[PDB]
Design a protein around this nucleic acid. Structure first.
Lengths: 63, 63, 97
RNA sequence: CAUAUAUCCUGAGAGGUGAUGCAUAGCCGAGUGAGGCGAAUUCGGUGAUCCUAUGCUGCCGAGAAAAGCCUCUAGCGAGGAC
RNA sequence: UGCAUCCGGUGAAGCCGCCGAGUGAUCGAGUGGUGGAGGGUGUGGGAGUGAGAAUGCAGGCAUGAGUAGCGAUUAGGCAAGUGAGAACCUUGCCCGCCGAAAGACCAAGGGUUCCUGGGCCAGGCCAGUCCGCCCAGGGUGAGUCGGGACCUAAGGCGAGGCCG
RNA sequence: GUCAACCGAGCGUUGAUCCGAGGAUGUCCGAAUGGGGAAACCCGGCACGAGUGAUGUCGUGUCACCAGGCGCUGAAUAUAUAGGCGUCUGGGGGGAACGCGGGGAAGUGAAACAUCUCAGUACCCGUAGGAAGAGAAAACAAAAUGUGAUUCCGUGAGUAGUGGCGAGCGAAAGCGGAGGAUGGCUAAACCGUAUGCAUGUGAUACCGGGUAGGGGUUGUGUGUGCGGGGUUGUGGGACCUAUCUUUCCGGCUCUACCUGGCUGGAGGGCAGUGAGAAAAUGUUGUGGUUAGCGGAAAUGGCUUGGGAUGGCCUGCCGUAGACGGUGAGAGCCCGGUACGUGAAAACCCGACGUCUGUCUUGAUGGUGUUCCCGAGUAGCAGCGGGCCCGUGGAAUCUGCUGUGAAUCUGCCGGGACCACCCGGUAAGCCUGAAUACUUCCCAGUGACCGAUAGCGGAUUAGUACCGUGAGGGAAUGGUGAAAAGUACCCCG
């Protein structure tokens, strides 16, 4: 959900600021997607968690 | 019997001496329990003889 | 190099009026090692005294708790073996009456 | 092919043995306390909340598991059973 | 406590008195007793430096006061014994109480309280020669009893695993 | 051994007890790991031994899980993979403080309270090391022809600032110091080689030219690995291309001949367990540590006293008049002190060596052009964090989400932004010293406490006791110089 199985990208932590400037803790999660990758041209498909940046970088081989 | 000549005996007679000292200790324990022997130091001496024989055997085995 | 003898399983005899009453029945009481079993005791007694053993009975006893100026102290716990010999019955003289 | 108080299974209890033993009312002494001897023991009544009974009958609210035991093959087998 | 001086087992401090002293906090290199190892003075330096009270804290002890109470709804008596000592301990004979218990046996819990011998400062709501108290020694024996080595329930833990 | 003696037995000049170093043994529990379990107690498998007439029984090894190597096999299923089997090497847990990276309060202050403060504190999670972290400019600076990695200390300064411009919070440049390593290695362009995957005018093609072959040093690609080569800001480097050139020998650059490059072997160096590659192995250093030993001088006189270590008076030593003990204030009585001395062994520091790596197939300063200089990165946008800076005109740094470049007339910074100047060269990695701390060990110190004090704990102390539990938590020192601790008699 929050950790990429490829690059180790993890959630950041910050504050949520209201108009009255009340600061409350919140999280910034990565865009983690479940992708069936093809590690080898043999064709084995395994369900892995990859961020959308990893998909963009072609790092997850969804063949 | 000091370790000096205790190191002269071979393995077999060393085992025999260990056996005989063990029977001696058994007899001394029974005599003390029934309360008839006077020399209390015999138990200590026989225990230390057993320890010495064990030490010599272990030294020979380890080299 | 461990040399296992039958004589470290048996520690000491028990000297008491009950023990003597049993001895006149040819039943002997020993203090044995706390981690020995009945058949091990029977084998050891047979090897030591070259006799035939009918049965072995064992009891565990908790040590007595005693009071001291430093506080409460406990004596060691012992295991007792009550050994009955066969009808051949050569008495164990090492028991020293 | 069978309806049988047939057959089998389970099963309180009665009876026999266990029991020429053991125990006992007592009687002798002995006096902390130890010892020896030791009669008769049928027949009825009452009667369980216990047993047959994890039975039987009724009812709805519809009332553990596994081991164990038996049997079946798969499979081991030249020795194996009583 | 720096420095400088002086006193001390021919008796310092501390404590208890006597006799005095200063305007005050206080003083007595004045004295007697007790005691047994360190003190005084001057001049500087530094303070955990002064208590009567916070329903203050710790220890010791008063007042109430030789007062209340001495823990059920059964009940004790006598004779003899032991003993320094007896209402309470022992023995005997009575009397009374429970008797679906206040009898007998287990489980949980306790842990040696069990037995023998000894004791009598503490404890026992009195006393105690007695005791579940104190001291020493002794005592618990299993193929079949209750458990394990047999089986599972609820539930627990949980190889990998999924999720975070 | 001691409380702590009372006995009973014994050892020791043939060297005990005792002190230091190195070994051996080391039940059971505990990360606990053969399986189970209510920690310290139950039940095993395998192998090899012991024992028994045989079963029973005993001894010694070994049997957890996961991770990473290597080898074998390869499900559904075909390629194969997941998985399985075997075998090696690691891990696991504990620890007082100090470090780094994450998460993150409230009481409180603002005389209320929400922004703000408290405070990035308490606490929690993950991880170390003897220290850590940071570190070699995409830095400051301001026109000085200036500094030159990082860290820490003092100032700058309670200043500039910031803030319901409230309570409050609060820099940096510069300058003075500690320490110095202004330190090293890479990636790419290009070469060579090896290989995987595609194919192949499958020949006039690839060696440096001239000669002669040949149809593959493949012919072409592409990917990967390995070895060269290249580590830079005045840009640097490859590609070229002249000039100058400080070992020898050998084998290769398709093949032989004459020319230019790759590669081994001998000197010569040069470095070293170091950041700059690594594991070792020897000899030596009155170098160090871990037990020790020696070490001057009063039985002095008189007096008081139970006792002299007091008073008075004589000597003596002093590289020693530190401090304790001894029957009352001891330099000369004892332990010691100044000062000297001492290590079989182990360990720690050095040094010199074997050893290893490495340069010599090499080096110089020159000339004009193509290629390379770290990509899902920088930048931009949205929402946050943190900086003196509380979103503000908000630079520099940073997290998530989108979008997304250029390789030097490129890019980043100089507090919005633009132009010009100046500085630097991001998206790769290592790095010692200066600094923080003390569970523990050794040696000392105190205008610190002296038993209601000082640690809770001078005494049974994290004990008794209290609590189901996490946890809470006491009180108790002094005879005498020596026990010489009151024989014996009397009342009881």
């Amino acid at each position: 959900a929050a950790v990429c199985d490829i690059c180790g990208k993890g959630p950041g932590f910050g504050k949520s600021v209201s108009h009255s400037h009340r600061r409350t803790s919140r999280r910034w999660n990565p865009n983690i997607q479940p992708v069936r990758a093809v590690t080898r041209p043999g064709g084995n498909k395994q369900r892995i968690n990859a961020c959308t940046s990893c998909i963009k970088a072609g790092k997850v081989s969804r063949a | 019997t000091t370790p000096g000549e205790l190191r002269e005996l071979t393995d077999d007679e060393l085992k025999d001496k260990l056996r005989e000292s063990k029977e001696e200790l058994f007899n001394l324990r029974f005599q003390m329990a029934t309360g008839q022997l006077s020399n209390n130091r015999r138990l200590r001496t026989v225990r230390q003889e057993i320890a010495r024989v064990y030490t010599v055997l272990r030294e020979r085995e380890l080299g | 190099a461990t040399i296992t003898d039958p004589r470290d399983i048996i520690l000491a005899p028990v000297i008491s009026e009950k023990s003597y009453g049993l001895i006149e029945d040819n039943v002997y009481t020993f203090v044995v090692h706390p981690d020995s079993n009945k058949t091990q005791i029977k084998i050891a007694i047979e090897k030591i005294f070259d006799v035939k053993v009918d049965s072995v009975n064992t009891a565990n006893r908790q040590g007595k708790r005693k009071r001291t100026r430093t506080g409460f102290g406990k004596r060691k716990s012992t295991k007792r073996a009550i050994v009955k010999l066969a009808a051949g019955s050569k008495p164990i003289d090492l028991f020293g009456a």
